[PDB]
Design a protein around this ligand. Structure first.
Ligand SMILES: *[C@@H]1O[C@H](CO)[C@@H](O)[C@H](O)[C@H]1NC(C)=O
Lengths: 219, 118
């Protein structure tokens, strides 16, 4: 339902970078209230940047350059009304749409509820393998936990419907195996930027959920 | 506002060719610019058919799909797509999407139903 969860703050930024090489046709930001779509911004290379009147003095684009590959949505002064699920939708030829869904919630630092269960370190330049140490498990999620946001790196599932494509910009290798096994996440050619908290979330059919948190350190 | 018009269901027989109609309704006084049309199968990774205002058509497999009403040098308003040689795996829901400015994207879902023989 969402690819990234960000913590509500005054000048929060909803990160969205197009990761494909296709030339953009149009980019749009929208927000789902409960079931309806408010248009926030629309950019097309044949026109000027269009921001709806309801958001003209509420959001702006800080980390963009020509072409607008980075369409991150920064807020001037974000309020309770900005809580919800946002949609960053890139359109291109001939690939079509590339969508990223960002859920804005009210919370404290996400690292508080994610204490480290293991300390893994590795030298820069190696393929780090994060093995998750977690009948009737249904869904498995790999995510990187930061104080301001949580990014889903991998979402595996056996029975139900999902071939989840990670919208995380950094390249990671996931395995959605069928023998219920040690869920691993591979960080190819890990650098110092890949350091942080990586959480393995297993969700069973009972509603039970268990978390295993690995703190990765790349000196 | 700009609204996509399409039926909820399109029936077709096994082995026949069927056309999924999908049109963009825009009021006579409202200005809009449609950049490209996109068909996607509900439950897949990417799109199966795209028509760009300048680049023309593109299909996941060119032999099975065809934009029957989209044409270069004309207003992109009709995204109707014909599917050739219906097989049982073509059964499902399909998304017809219009990329418009400045209104944004408008989409609708169409249930393609493949019928068996007598
Ligand atoms: C759109 O194209 C389909 C395919 O032939 C056609 O049946 C339909 O009448 C067209 N709609 C409009 C409004 O022209």
């Amino acid at each position: 339902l969402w690819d990234t969860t960000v913590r509500l703050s005054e000048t929060m930024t909803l990160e969205c970078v197009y990761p494909l090489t296709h030339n953009l046709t149009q980019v749009e930001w929208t927000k789902n209230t409960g079931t309806k779509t408010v248009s926030i911004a629309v950019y097309n290379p044949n026109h000027n940047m269009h921001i709806e009147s309801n958001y003209l003095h509420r959001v702006h684009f800080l980390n963009s350059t020509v072409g607008f590959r980075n369409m991150s949505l920064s807020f001037y002064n974000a309020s309770e009304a900005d809580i919800g699920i946002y949609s960053c939708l890139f359109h291109a030829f001939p690939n079509g749409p590339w969508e990223k869904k960002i859920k804005v919630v009210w919370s404290d630092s996400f690292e508080i509820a994610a204490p480290s269960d293991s300390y893994l370190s590795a030298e820069p330049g190696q393929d780090v393998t994060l093995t998750c140490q977690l009948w009737p498990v249904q869904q498995v999620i790999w995510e990187k936990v930061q104080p301001h946001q949580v990014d889903i790196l991998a979402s595996c599932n056996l029975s139900q419907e999902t071939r989840y494509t990670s919208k995380y910009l950094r390249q990671t290798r996931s395995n959605c195996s069928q023998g219920s096994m040690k869920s691993i996440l591979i960080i190819p050619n890990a650098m110092a930027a890949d350091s942080g908290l990586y959480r393995c979330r297993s969700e069973a059919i009972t509603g039970k959920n268990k978390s295993f948190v690995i703190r990765l350190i790349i000196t | 506002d700009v609204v996509v018009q399409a039926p909820t269901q399109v029936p077709g027989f096994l082995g026949d060719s069927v056309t999924l109609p999908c049109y963009l309704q825009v009021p006579n006084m409202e200005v809009t610019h449609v950049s490209q049309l996109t068909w996607a199968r509900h439950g897949e990774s990417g799109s199966m058919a795209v028509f760009h205002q300048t680049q023309g058509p593109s299909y996941s497999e060119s032999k099975r799909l065809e934009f029957v009403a989209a044409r270069l040098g004309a207003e992109l308003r009709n995204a109707s797509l014909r599917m050739f040689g219906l097989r049982v795996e073509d059964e499902g829901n399909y998304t017809c999407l219009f990329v418009t400015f400045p209104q944004g994207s408008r989409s609708v879902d169409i249930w393609l139903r493949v019928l068996a023989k007598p």
